[PDB]
Design a binder for this molecule. Structure first.
Ligand SMILES: CCCCC/C=C\C/C=C\C/C=C\C/C=C\CCCC(=O)O
Ligand SMILES: CCCCC/C=C\C/C=C\C/C=C\C/C=C\CCCC(=O)O
Ligand SMILES: CCCCC/C=C\C/C=C\C/C=C\C/C=C\CCCC(=O)O
Ligand SMILES: CCCCC/C=C\C/C=C\C/C=C\C/C=C\CCCC(=O)O
Lengths: 168, 168, 168, 168, 168
């Protein structure tokens, strides 16, 4: 690439993997969102919580793809595996899965940051810092808060309804 | 002091002690507020209730320091001891501690007022009356109301959630 | 903590110490501010300069406490020692003490950043960079400028008056 | 008086004396104000400072006369003695005289308050508290601040000019 | 050049030299400006005075380059020598250097105008008259005024502070 400078092939490849992770996460949240839109689940607040996350994750992927091109790396797309579940159980089950999911994204972010440090790629580090690292931390704190409130509320049916009505 | 008039050394010293009490109270509410901001406590309404109180108590201290200077007394600051607890338990536990705290502030206000009467310091008395005495009484009534409602709600997890959602 | 990830116990403890440092600094500026509000000192511009700093330092502490919770660390509060002085002398004396104070805060920030690097905690590093490091540098430059102007003006009484009137 | 209730003849008489004191003070400030308006004194800021005080003192007298009538006391006016000086010297001289003056007013206020306590006249006490006591304290603090700044500035001619230009 | 008409090679070359002079002047003012922004100099008004001049001189150069092209002359750029000093001393020192600098620019303008007369180039003369000659005269008068006021003020530290505060 005529523009490529200080951009290691290792980071380039890891960015492509992270794109796949973010699109996988988006797909997972799409599935979560529509599960809670089921007539036999019917928790609209939960559906909107996860649909908004699907969108955030997709935008994460796009931001990465844009940066990939800005550095002169080459996007390589791979198959996107389907979410790990077809049905997601209670709001509690779903929020637990989501936080596991976010932690895995966060760890991939940290790994990519470590890679960038090792490759002495300060632009990559700045990029991760500005658009991802604090985002993840805040999201995970939020999910932690929700988990705690969901769990305080478990009259399990009553609790699930109230959480969706009054928090989500 | 060129401006000092009818301001006893006893009141001056007691005002300095009260400043320390108010800053101690502010510190206590800071600790309360951030405890409820913990991901494993997660009661945002409670966190905001106590953070607002931290701010009120700090402003109380400042009002006292300003009056101290207006009378030609000399501010003397002392170490501020840390709050009595590191973790504050339930909203009920926390509100009980807060009302104990406010009662102690109120008693210090009353003591200072008695001192002012004994020292025949009508400016001090007016000052306490305008900016503190009714404030405390109203705050303590509010905390009393909350305690009663919190207690009515003890499904303890459910009650704590509902109180935070619908009152705080 | 359910949310805690890549947050070392060393950083957690150092963040708690830094909170104590920032609250100590806030307390010091409170004392500075009210000293200059004394009828026998009477430099309103200086009083407002330091009172605004007290507020900035308190907000620094709060930002740290919020981040502590966001990472799943646990706030631990300690006694706050009283400021190093009861009276602060001239504006020059006071500004010299303030810059010593800011340098000590800045050094604690740098130490904490070094700790974060050693612990490979990129979120911590981003956090310090966004909300503290440049803030300190700018504040210290400002105090440096003031010190130089104060010193140019030492007709010491005249100089102190003019600085407060025309700069502060 | 058909309306008179709990209003002692002692307080009534003391209110009349205080009216005379306030009108005397107003007259003194009138003299101060116009002295600084002299072509050979020419300190417009000082002239306006004292003219505004003349007006405040006159309004104090009126407030007292209104209260006198509200309680069913009878205003009795006496000769108003001329101010203690015909020329007031420097701004420093003038501000020193003013603070002596305000202290004497404040002491008369305190005496009247003590009288009211002894006579168990809570309306009188409330009246003094709302409209005079804090007013005096604030004014005296202000004059204290000015005295300190004036004195810091004593290049006596230069200092007097700068104070008037930059503070008054 | 297809457009070149009545534009002597002598004027063309002299315009290129004048561009170098104006860029040199801009560089000198950049250095002046940032010197006064030093924490140990700290005269913000002086810094802004010289930074604005740096910008004016750069725009002078650009205006000349534009005219060069409008006449069908060819811009030829040369090395720009660094300013004559690294540190500029007092405001007085700096303003003296600036006026020497402006006089040298003005003389180069006059020389170029004389050249234009000799070459019977009325467009060049009009150009210098409209955009430079009166500009220089006004700037030099301004610097003359400042020099006189700076010098009246030499309590050298006090004077330098007051000039920056009240004139610049
Ligand atoms: C502007 C609103 C966007 C809302 C997006 C919400 C959820 C996204 C759901 C699934 C995305 C996962 C895989 C789809 C593959 C590519 C998406 C195209 C990018 C886009 O479509 O941009
Ligand atoms: C919103 C205005 C804030 C102005 C603050 C200015 C000065 C703060 C002075 C002292 C603070 C130092 C110790 C007090 C302990 C806790 C403060 C409560 C937090 C808050 O009170 O938030
Ligand atoms: C509405 C503007 C009032 C400005 C007053 C400023 C200075 C007052 C000066 C002298 C007053 C002292 C004795 C005069 C006696 C009675 C004043 C009439 C009440 C009034 O005149 O009300
Ligand atoms: C629009 C704001 C302009 C502010 C300019 C202020 C100072 C200029 C400082 C140094 C210029 C001297 C040499 C630089 C060489 C070419 C400048 C590019 C022209 C431009 O940069 O135009």
């Amino acid at each position: 690439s005529q523009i490529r400078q200080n951009y290691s092939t290792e980071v380039e490849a890891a960015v492509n993997r992270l794109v796949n992770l973010y699109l996988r996460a988006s797909y997972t949240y799409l599935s979560l969102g529509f599960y809670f839109d089921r007539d036999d689940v019917a928790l609209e607040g939960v559906c909107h919580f996860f649909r908004e996350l699907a969108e955030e994750k997709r935008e994460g992927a796009e931001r990465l793809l844009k940066m990939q091109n800005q550095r002169g790396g080459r996007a390589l797309f791979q198959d996107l595996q389907k979410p790990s579940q077809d049905e997601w159980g209670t709001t509690l089950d779903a929020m637990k899965a989501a936080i596991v999911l976010e932690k895995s994204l966060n760890q991939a972010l940290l790994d990519l940051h470590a890679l960038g440090s090792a490759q002495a790629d300060p632009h990559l580090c700045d990029f991760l810092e500005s658009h991802f690292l604090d985002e993840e931390v805040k999201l995970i704190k939020k999910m932690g808060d929700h988990l705690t409130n969901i769990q305080r509320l478990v009259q399990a049916g009553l609790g699930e309804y109230l959480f969706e009505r009054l928090t989500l």
